[PDB]
RNA sequence: UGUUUUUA
RNA sequence: UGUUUUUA
C-alpha cells in the first residue's frame, strides 16, 4: 500500500488545498497536494485501531466486598454483605465508559472474568478454601434474599462456582433486546412527566449475585470480587464527540457543577509555542 | 457546460425550497432515507406510508441570532408533533419511523460576519444541570417547534445549557464528527442535512423517544456592519421523508 | 508430554457448560425405547395450546368462577373485561403460556386470544374485542377501543372467536417480567350491540377466555420462575 | 478449531480490513473532487 | 422462515377467526387472519426452548 | 479563564503587516490538540506516525480580503519568531476569497518512523504558525476582529499503535445509578 | 518474552501463607502511572495487565515495541541540541513501564 | 465543464502559493526556465542542481503602499542572497544560473482603487543622479530583500529614483515592452511572472551581476474608501527554479 | 502449530544457517586472495 | 375479471 | 509539446 506518492512542482488551476469546510466534508488532501513528495509505503495495516481491538480487551467494571461469616442472628444477608448483587453495567468505571461512548450503538458478545481475592484482617489461623458462587439473575428471576436461599439453586439461572484466589471465565452472547445496545438514549420509558430519562432496560444486561457457598469459620474472611469484561465480535455505529467532563451517574450524561476547565490554558498568548 | 451547485431546489409534496447560496447538501453517513425492508421488520402490522401529505417541508418559527446568542436545539420527531398531518399520525400510532431533510436558513449581506454550526446528533441524551443522578423531565426534552434556547436560564428538572459542553459533557469542537454543515455568511446562507432513520430498532415510539437532535450553534459570533440591526433571523425548515407509521390506535396523551 | 497452559476459569463449575464426562456405569445397557404418544421436542409446541385465562380475577380465593367472564343482558356500549398484556403477570401468570413464559426473560411474536360463549343457543350477542397497542392508556370507552386493533364478534353457531394480538413492537423483543418500556399494551372487550337472552332465561351468562402462542412466538434467556418457592428441602 | 457449540464462545474476529472513511468524511449529496471548486 | 405473510383486506366466507373450541383443537390462527400484515422473517430457531436446553 | 466558544476563534486584526496570527507546537496528544477528536483518539495510543491535515476557515465579511501564510516548522529548530523565519519551512500562502477554507497538510517529517503521542523531546513534531502575508483589509462600515476556525484531521497515511489508557478522564469512586 | 516470578515471605509472626494475587500492569509512556494501590489506573481498560498468584508465575510475549527499526544499545547523541540535555539516554529504548501491586486486601500480618 | 483561471496553486518544494483572484501568469518571452544544455555550456565543471532545497518560494519583507508611494525595485539574484540555502550556494559558488517565479501580492476590498505595474527588466542598468560619468556604487545596486524604494531620497554614489524615468532615462509608459503584469485592485490581487535565465553568457557570477530586476510601480494611485487606513501591504514572493551552481569554492566576501 | 494470532507469540527461529564472515573479515574494496601479495 | 405472487 | 509513469 502506497503512503505517499511521488509528486513534483505544481502550477495548476486545481487547488486541492482550497475548499469549503462549510460543506461539512473533509476533503482527502494529502502531503502530495501541499509539498513535493517522495514515494513511501505504509508497512502498516491499522490492526490495533479496529474496534474489536479498541473495545475488545478486558477491563474492571465492578468491585465488591463480601464476607464469609456466621449468618446466625442476621436478618438481611444482602446488607450484611453475606452476598452482594450487581446490576450489570459497563458505565461504572469511566475509562471503559469513555471508549464505548465514542459510539452511539454497540453490539458485542461479552466475556466475563471474575477474580475473587480473600483477606483476613483480623486474627486467623489459616486461609480458608472458599468457593464463590456467581449467579446471573436476569430481570424477572427471583433476586436472592438470603445467602443460602432457594434462589441460589439456579435450576435455570446460569451460575459459576470457583475457588477464591482463582478465577472464573465465561462468554455471554449479545443479550440486548434491540439489534444493538444503546450507549445513549434520548428518550423515556413512556410518556410521563416524572419518568427516567436516558435510563432504559434496553441496556439491562441483567444482574450478578455473589456469595461464598462455604459455611462460616471462626474468623471473618473478606472477599473482594473484581468483575472484568471483554467485548468480542464488536460492532459499533455512529461515532460521537469524546467525553470531556467527568461523569456523575451511570447511564446519564450528567457532569458536575463547578467542574474544572478541560481546555488546557496556554502559558502566554495565542502566538506562544 | 455551465450551471451551479449553489443554486438548488428541493420539492417535497406541495412544498418547494429554493436556495441560491447553498453549500453542498449533507447526507448523514452517506445513507439516504428508505422505507423499512421485510428482513429488518419485527412488527407484523402493515405500515402506513403517508406519502405527500406528511412528506413536505414544515417551516419552524424563526429564531433571532444576536451577538450574545449561545445557540438552539430541536428534537425530532418532537419538533414536528404539531405540524399538520405528520403530528396527528405521530400521536395516533404506537410506532413511527422517519427520515428528515433539514434546511436551515440564515441570510445576510456581504458586510456581515458570523458562522453557524448546523449539526445533527443521533441520541442526543441531554445532561441535567443539577448533576448527580438527577433526570431531565419529559417536558423539557420535548419542547416542540419552540426547541431549546441554550442562551436561556436553567429550570428545575431542565437540561444543562452550556453550549460549550454540548449539553452532554462533550466539547463543542468535536461535534463535527456528527453530520454537520456551517452557515458561513460570507460563503453560505443555507445548510441542508438529509437524515436517514437512525435507531437500534427498525421502528420505535415517536412520542417517548427522539432519534435525532438538530443543533444550530453560533461559533464565530454575529458581527453586523456599523448602524445595522444587531440581529439576524434563523429559520429552520424540516421535511419528513420515507415516513412509516404502525399500530394505529387511540390518540396518545403526553405530558403538558 | 504435550506442553500446555491452563487458562483462567480452570476448575470452575459452570452450570450451563455442556461437556463430556466419565460414565460411572461403564458398559451399562439402558432400557430399550418404546413408542410413547405425546413426545415433546420443544416448549414452543405446547405453548401453542389454548389454556383458560382466570380473567374474572376478582375472587377472595381461587375459584372456577375466576375463569368465567360475566355477560349481562341489555347492556349497550359497556365494557365486558379489561387487562394489560404483561403475559408473565396478572391474569396470564397462572396460564400455561404465562408459566412457560416466566421460565424465560425475553418474548416476541403474536398472542392468540380466544373467547368461547356458553350462553343459551337461543341467545344473541355482538362483542368487540379490542387490542390497544402500547403508548396509549387502556380504553375507557368503546369508541376509544375500536380505534385500535379489534374484532367485532357475532355470537352464533360458531361459539368461539379467535382474535390474534399482532406483534406490535418497535424493539424486537419484550420482557416477560412487567416492564414499562416493553409494555405490550391492553386488551379489552365491549358490547357491540348487547346480550339478548331468550324468554324464560335469567341472570348472567359467561365467556371462557383462552390464551395461546402463534407459531411466530419466540422465547429466550432461560431464568428461574417466581411461581414456586421453598424454605426447606423436601423429604419423602 | 472451536471447542464450543456457541458462536459467543469463539475468539475475536481480528480486523475488518474493509474501511470506508467517506461515510464520515464526505457525507455529501453531490460529489466533491479534490482540486475542483467546492462550490460553483 | 416466514413469520408473517403479506395479507390485505379480506371479504370472505372463510372466517378463520370463528371456530369451535368445543372440539378441543387450537386452530393455528395467525395475525394474517385478523389484520393486514407485512412480510416478516423469524430470524429465530427456537433453540433455547428445546427440552434438552429447558431440562 | 474558562472553556469558551471563543477558545475556538483565532482573532484576526485589520491593517496588521508582517505579524503573527497564531502559534503552537505539534504535540497532538497535548496542548490545543488534547481535546480534539484527533487528540482524544491519539491519547488512547502510545505511538503515532503519518501526516496531519490542518484547515483554516475564514468567517469575516465576503467584502473583506486577506492573505495569510501557514508555516510548518520541522523539529530541530525553534518556533519561528518572525515571518521570514517561518517561510523558510513548509508553508502555504493562503489567499482568502470565494473558497473560505485552506487545507495545509503537515507532511510527516521525521527520522524515526514513529513519534510518541505523549510530549517527548526526541519525537517532537515541530511547530505550526500563521502570519499575515499581506494584511487583513475590512470593507467600509465594518469594525473589530474577524475570526478563523481551525480544524485538525488525520491523513490516510496516519498510524497509531500500542493502546494505552488516557489521562483525559479520571475517577475516585465507582459510579452509581 | 517476559516471565514474572513472585515469591512471598512473612518475616514476622504469621499464622498462614496468604494466597495473594499480584497484578503486573504495563504502563507505556503517556498512560497514567498508578498513584495509589487501588487507583482507577489499575482498571487497565486499555493497558495490558496480568494477574497471577504469588508463588506461581506469569508468562507473556511482547512484540518489538521500538519506534525505530531496531533498539539502540548505544546512542551517540542527544534528545535535542541543548547544552544540558541527557547524553546516550533516549526514548528510542523506552520499552515502557511495569507496575506491580497485590490486589488482595490486607491481612493482620 | 466549469472551473476557474483566477484560482491558481503553485507548489515548489515544501512551499505552496494559492491565489483566488489571479491574472493569467506571465512567462517572460514565452520561454520557461530550463537547465543549461551541453551545446551551450562553456564551463567544464559539473553543475550543482540544488533541487527543492532552493527551488522554493521565499517571501520578501512586505512593503507599504501609500498614496505617495513612487514604487519599489528588487535585483535578482541579489534579493535572495540571504534566503536559506539558495543564498549560501550563491556565495559558495563562482558561477550561478537561475530562473524565477515572481509572485507579487496586494489584496484590497472592492471599494479600493489603484493599479500596480509589476515588471521584470533584464539588465536594468541604473542611472546615477549625479549625472556625468558618475558610477552607482555596489552597495546601492545590491540592497538585498530590502530592495530600492524609489520614494526615498538620493544618496552619494546611489541611483536616481525618479520612477517616471525608470531610473535609467527611459519613460515609465514603455516598460510594458518588458514582461509585466498589473495588479488592478478591481480585477486582480496577485501578479505572477515566470522568468527564464536571461544572459549573453550560459552561466555567470551571481554576486557581481544582476540578470533581472523586479519593479513594482503604482500607476493609478491608491485611493482607499472613506475612513480606511491609507495603506496597503505589498508582499513579494520569489522562487528560484532550474537553478544551477558551478565552481564551488571558499565563500565570497562582498561589500558591506 | 501456532496457538496464537500474534507473530510475537511464536517460538524462536532456531538458526540462520546463512553465515558470511566476509563482511567483517574482508571489508575491503579491492579483492584480496590468500596467497597473492596483499599489496603490490 | 373489485384476483394473488414473482421479476424489471 | 515547460507532460506523468514503467523498464534497461
UniProtKB/Swiss-Prot annotation, chain A:
Signal peptide: none annotated. It is found in: Virion; Host cytoplasm. It comes from the Viruses. Forms an icosahedral capsid of pseudo T=3 symmetry with capsid proteins VP2 and VP3. The capsid is 300 Angstroms in diameter, composed of 60 copies of each capsid protein and enclosing the viral positive strand RNA genome. Capsid protein VP1 mainly forms the vertices of the capsid. Capsid protein VP1 interacts with host ICAM1 to provide virion attachment to target host cells. This attachment induces virion internalization. Tyrosine kinases are probably involved in the entry process. After binding to its receptor, the capsid undergoes conformational changes. Interacts with capsid protein VP0, and capsid protein VP3 to form heterotrimeric protomers. Five protomers subsequently associate to form pentamers which serve as building blocks for the capsid. Interacts with capsid protein VP2, capsid protein VP3 and capsid protein VP4 following cleavage of capsid protein VP0. Interacts with host ICAM1. This is Capsid protein VP1. It comes from Human rhinovirus 14.
From Swiss-Prot, chain F:
Signal peptide: none annotated. It is found in: Virion; Host cytoplasm. It comes from the Viruses. Interacts with capsid protein VP0 and capsid protein VP1 to form heterotrimeric protomers. Five protomers subsequently associate to form pentamers which serve as building blocks for the capsid. Interacts with capsid protein VP4 in the mature capsid. Interacts with protein 2C; this interaction may be important for virion morphogenesis. Forms an icosahedral capsid of pseudo T=3 symmetry with capsid proteins VP2 and VP3. The capsid is 300 Angstroms in diameter, composed of 60 copies of each capsid protein and enclosing the viral positive strand RNA genome. This is Capsid protein VP3. It comes from Human rhinovirus 14 (HRV-14).
Amino acid at each position: 500500500t502506497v503512503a505517499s506518492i511521488s509528486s513534483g512542482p505544481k502550477h495548476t488551476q486545481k487547488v486541492p488545498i482550497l475548499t469549503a469546510n462549510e460543506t461539512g466534508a473533509t476533503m482527502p488532501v494529502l502531503p502530495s497536494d501541499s509539498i513535493e513528495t517522495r514515494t513511501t509505503y505504509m508497512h502498516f495495516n491499522g490492526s490495533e485501531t479496529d474496534v474489536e481491538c479498541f473495545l475488545g480487551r478486558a477491563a474492571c467494571v465492578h468491585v465488591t466486598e463480601i464476607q464469609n461469616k456466621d449468618a446466625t442472628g442476621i436478618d438481611n444477608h444482602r446488607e450484611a454483605k453475606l452476598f452482594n448483587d450487581w446490576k450489570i453495567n459497563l458505565s461504572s468505571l469511566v475509562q471503559l465508559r469513555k471508549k464505548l461512548e465514542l459510539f452511539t450503538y454497540v453490539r458485542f458478545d461479552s466475556e466475563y472474568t471474575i477474580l475473587a481475592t480473600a483477606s483476613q484482617p483480623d486474627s486467623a489461623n489459616y486461609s480458608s478454601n472458599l468457593v464463590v458462587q456467581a449467579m446471573y439473575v436476569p430481570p424477572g428471576a427471583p433476586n436472592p434474599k438470603e445467602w443460602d436461599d432457594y434462589t441460589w439453586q439456579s435450576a435455570s439461572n446460569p451460575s459459576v462456582f470457583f475457588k477464591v484466589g482463582d478465577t472464573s471465565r465465561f462468554s455471554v452472547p449479545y443479550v440486548g433486546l434491540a439489534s444493538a445496545y444503546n450507549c445513549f438514549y434520548d428518550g423515556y420509558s413512556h410518556d410521563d412527566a416524572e419518568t427516567q430519562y436516558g435510563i432504559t432496560v434496553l441496556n439491562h444486561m441483567g444482574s450478578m449475585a455473589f456469595r461464598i457457598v462455604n459455611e462460616h469459620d471462626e474468623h471473618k474472611t473478606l472477599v473482594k470480587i473484581r468483575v472484568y469484561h471483554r467485548a468480542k465480535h464488536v460492532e459499533a455505529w455512529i461515532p460521537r464527540a469524546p467525553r470531556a467532563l467527568p461523569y456523575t451517574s451511570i447511564g446519564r450524561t450528567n457532569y458536575p457543577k463547578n467542574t474544572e476547565p478541560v481546555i488546557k490554558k496556554r502559558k502566554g498568548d495565542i502566538k506562544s509555542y | 457546460c455551465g450551471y451551479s451547485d449553489r443554486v438548488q431546489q428541493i420539492t417535497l409534496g406541495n412544498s418547494t425550497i429554493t436556495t441560491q447560496e447553498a453549500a453542498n447538501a449533507v447526507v448523514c453517513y452517506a445513507e439516504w432515507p428508505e422505507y423499512l425492508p421485510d428482513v429488518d421488520a419485527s412488527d407484523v402490522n402493515k405500515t402506513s406510508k403517508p406519502d405527500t401529505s406528511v412528506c413536505r417541508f414544515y417551516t419552524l418559527d424563526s429564531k433571532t441570532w444576536t451577538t450574545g446568542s449561545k445557540g438552539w436545539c430541536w428534537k425530532l420527531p418532537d419538533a414536528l408533533k404539531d405540524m399538520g398531518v405528520f403530528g396527528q399520525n405521530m400521536f395516533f400510532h404506537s410506532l413511527g419511523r422517519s427520515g428528515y431533510t433539514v434546511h436551515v436558513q440564515c441570510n445576510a449581506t456581504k458586510f456581515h460576519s458570523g458562522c453557524l454550526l448546523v449539526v445533527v446528533i443521533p441520541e442526543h441524551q441531554l445532561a441535567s444541570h443539577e448533576g448527580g443522578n438527577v433526570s431531565v423531565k419529559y417536558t423539557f426534552t420535548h419542547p416542540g417547534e419552540r426547541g431549546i434556547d441554550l442562551s436561556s436560564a436553567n429550570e428545575v428538572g431542565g437540561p444543562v445549557k452550556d453550549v460549550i459542553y454540548n449539553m452532554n459533557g462533550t466539547l463543542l469542537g468535536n461535534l463535527l464528527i456528527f453530520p454537520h454543515q456551517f452557515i458561513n455568511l460570507r460563503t453560505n446562507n443555507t445548510a441542508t442535512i438529509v437524515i436517514p432513520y437512525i435507531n437500534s430498532v427498525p421502528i420505535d415510539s415517536m412520542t417517548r423517544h427522539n432519534n435525532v437532535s438538530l443543533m444550530v450553534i453560533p461559533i464565530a459570533p454575529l458581527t453586523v456592519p456599523t448602524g445595522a440591526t444587531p440581529s439576524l433571523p434563523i429559520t429552520v425548515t424540516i421535511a419528513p421523508m420515507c415516513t412509516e407509521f404502525s399500530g394505529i390506535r387511540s390518540k396518545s396523551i403526553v405530558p403538558q | 508430554g504435550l506442553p500446555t497452559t491452563t487458562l483462567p476459569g480452570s476448575g470452575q463449575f459452570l452450570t450451563t457448560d455442556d461437556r463430556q464426562s466419565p460414565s460411572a456405569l461403564p458398559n451399562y445397557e439402558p432400557t430399550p425405547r418404546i413408542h410413547i404418544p405425546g413426545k415433546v421436542h420443544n416448549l414452543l409446541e405446547i405453548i401453542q395450546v389454548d389454556t383458560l385465562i382466570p380473567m374474572n380475577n376478582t375472587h377472595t380465593k381461587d375459584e372456577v368462577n375466576s375463569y368465567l367472564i360475566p355477560l349481562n343482558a341489555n347492556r349497550q356500549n359497556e365494557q365486558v373485561f379489561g387487562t394489560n398484556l404483561f403475559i408473565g403477570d396478572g391474569v396470564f401468570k397462572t396460564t400455561l403460556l404465562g408459566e412457560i413464559v416466566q421460565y424465560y426473560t425475553h418474548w416476541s411474536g403474536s398472542l392468540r386470544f380466544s373467547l368461547m360463549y356458553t350462553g343459551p343457543a337461543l341467545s344473541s350477542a355482538k362483542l368487540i374485542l379490542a387490542y390497544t397497542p402500547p403508548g396509549a392508556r387502556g380504553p375507557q370507552d368503546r369508541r376509544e377501543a375500536m380505534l385500535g386493533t379489534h374484532v367485532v364478534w357475532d355470537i352464533g353457531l360458531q361459539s368461539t372467536i379467535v382474535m390474534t394480538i399482532p406483534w406490535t413492537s418497535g424493539v424486537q423483543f419484550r420482557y416477560t417480567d412487567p416492564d414499562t418500556y416493553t409494555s405490550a399494551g391492553f386488551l379489552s372487550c365491549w358490547y357491540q350491540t348487547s346480550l339478548i337472552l331468550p324468554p324464560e332465561t335469567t341472570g348472567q351468562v359467561y365467556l371462557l377466555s383462552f390464551i395461546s402462542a402463534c407459531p411466530d412466538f419466540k422465547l429466550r434467556l432461560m431464568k428461574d420462575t417466581q411461581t414456586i418457592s421453598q424454605t426447606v428441602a423436601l423429604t419423602e | 478449531i472451536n471447542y464450543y457449540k456457541d458462536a459467543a464462545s469463539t475468539s475475536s474476529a481480528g480486523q475488518s480490513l474493509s474501511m470506508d472513511p467517506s461515510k464520515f468524511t464526505e457525507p455529501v449529496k453531490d460529489l466533491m473532487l479534490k482540486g475542483a471548486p467546492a462550490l460553483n
